[PDB]
Amino acid sequence: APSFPFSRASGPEPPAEFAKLRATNPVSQVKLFDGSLAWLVTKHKDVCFVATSEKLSKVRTRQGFPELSASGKQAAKAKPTFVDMDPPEHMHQRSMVEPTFTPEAVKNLQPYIQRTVDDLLEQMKQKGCANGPVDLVKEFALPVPSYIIYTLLGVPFNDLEYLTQQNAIRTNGSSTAREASAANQELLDYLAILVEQRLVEPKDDIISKLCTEQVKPGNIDKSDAVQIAFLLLVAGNAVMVNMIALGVATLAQHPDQLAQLKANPSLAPQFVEELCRYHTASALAIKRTAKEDVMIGDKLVRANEGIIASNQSANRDEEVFENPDEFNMNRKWPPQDPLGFGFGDHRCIAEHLAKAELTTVFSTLYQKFPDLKVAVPLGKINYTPLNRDVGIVDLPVIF
Numbered sequence: 001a002p003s004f005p006f007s008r009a010s011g012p013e014p015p016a017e018f019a020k021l022r023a024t025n026p027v028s029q030v031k032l033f034d035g036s037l038a039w040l041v042t043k044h045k046d047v048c049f050v051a052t053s054e055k056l057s058k059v060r061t062r063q064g065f066p067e068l069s070a071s072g073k074q075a076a077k078a079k080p081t082f083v084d085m086d087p088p089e090h091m092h093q094r095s096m097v098e099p100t101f102t103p104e105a106v107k108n109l110q111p112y113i114q115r116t117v118d119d120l121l122e123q124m125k126q127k128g129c130a131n132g133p134v135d136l137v138k139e140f141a142l143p144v145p146s147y148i149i150y151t152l153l154g155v156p157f158n159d160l161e162y163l164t165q166q167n168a169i170r171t172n173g174s175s176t177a178r179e180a181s182a183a184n185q186e187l188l189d190y191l192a193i194l195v196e197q198r199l200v201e202p203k204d205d206i207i208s209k210l211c212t213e214q215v216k217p218g219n220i221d222k223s224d225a226v227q228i229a230f231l232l233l234v235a236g237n238a239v240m241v242n243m244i245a246l247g248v249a250t251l252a253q254h255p256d257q258l259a260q261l262k263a264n265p266s267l268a269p270q271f272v273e274e275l276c277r278y279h280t281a282s283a284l285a286i287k288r289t290a291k292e293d294v295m296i297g298d299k300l301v302r303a304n305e306g307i308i309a310s311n312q313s314a315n316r317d318e319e320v321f322e323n324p325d326e327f328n329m330n331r332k333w334p335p336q337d338p339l340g341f342g343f344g345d346h347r348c349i350a351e352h353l354a355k356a357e358l359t360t361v362f363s364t365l366y367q368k369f370p371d372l373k374v375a376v377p378l379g380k381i382n383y384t385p386l387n388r389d390v391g392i393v394d395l396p397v398i399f
């Protein structure tokens, strides 16, 4: 059994193993870093089954849970938040924070999302690029999701830049382990003070609603509110930054689609749909253990065996998406959902917000900067390390 996770075939590509597995061995065992095994599921239909089966569990204290790194093993020791819960605890906690993320709430947030994007773009214009390229990640892809989720949580305007930098440090590949851990703990300490403040004087933000609706009645404690807020910050932010950067790179890579999007920014939603299928920047979250035996395809997954369901592979499943390795914003979509945001009850709480952020970026960026260009050869883009989820570290641009 091969070692898993697999490395990307190159900067912007999925691991090569998945296509071959879909063709010849769609449910198979892989070996994890600790020498344990897990079942890897690669076809769309089977990923959907894993994501929804009530015989499967997200609880990480179950033996057989497929932890993919030594640090994941350590993190599993902590009191879980809803990401690692099963019913009924999962929705009992998740519902405490869903209101901000509903399709209607996100529709009503659209002017705020647009203003945030516009303001960051204007800062970019003002800054200029007269002395050379600037980094689209630092100047734009990082702050857009950061400023939004921090604002929604309740962070005041003046603190956004510093906290945006610190949250990046947690996941920057250049950070040492000490630097990432200290940044982590610094955000938690910050959020704890915010919770203390909003308990005394609530404001119109997510932390305040947790404090008033859940802490004060004793449904959760202060530290739970901190951990729920934290989860909302860290679960999707780095993924959003990568999706923005990947979108810009992809448009540069396919000039005619860029031309089409510039000619018709109303194509942004379909561009974003294709982007979230093609670049599955969170590919390792659909993990389970079997609570009891479960058959998947021609395999029996026994009680206490782990499962990893690759949404990345599902999103390239030729049986569902015709010509799946083609990026086509004019894709004719099948009835089956793309799985960039996962599936089932755990499906990304922020899917509508994320798509709105991406749609706003891709319907605005080239209106603002119709001559935006990646300022290095596309073959020299600095992607995330190949043994990690797809993403881009920095992206020099001119405009």
Ligand code: HEM
Residues within 6 Å of the ligand: 051, 082, 083, 084, 094, 145, 149, 231, 232, 233, 235, 236, 237, 239, 240, 243, 276, 281, 282, 283, 285, 286, 311, 339, 340, 341, 342, 343, 344, 345, 346, 347, 348, 349, 350, 351, 353, 354, 355
């Ligand atoms: C384009 C950007 C994003 C992508 C591709 C993405 C993808 C995902 C994926 C694949 C999952 C796993 C769902 C499952 O278990 O089936 C997920 C879960 C989650 N995401 Fe995102 N996400 C994104 C942005 C966000 C943002 C912006 C936030 C927060 C504001 C967020 C917060 C979460 C949370 C809390 C969960 C766990 C939900 C649960 O287990 O109940 N995500 N996301």
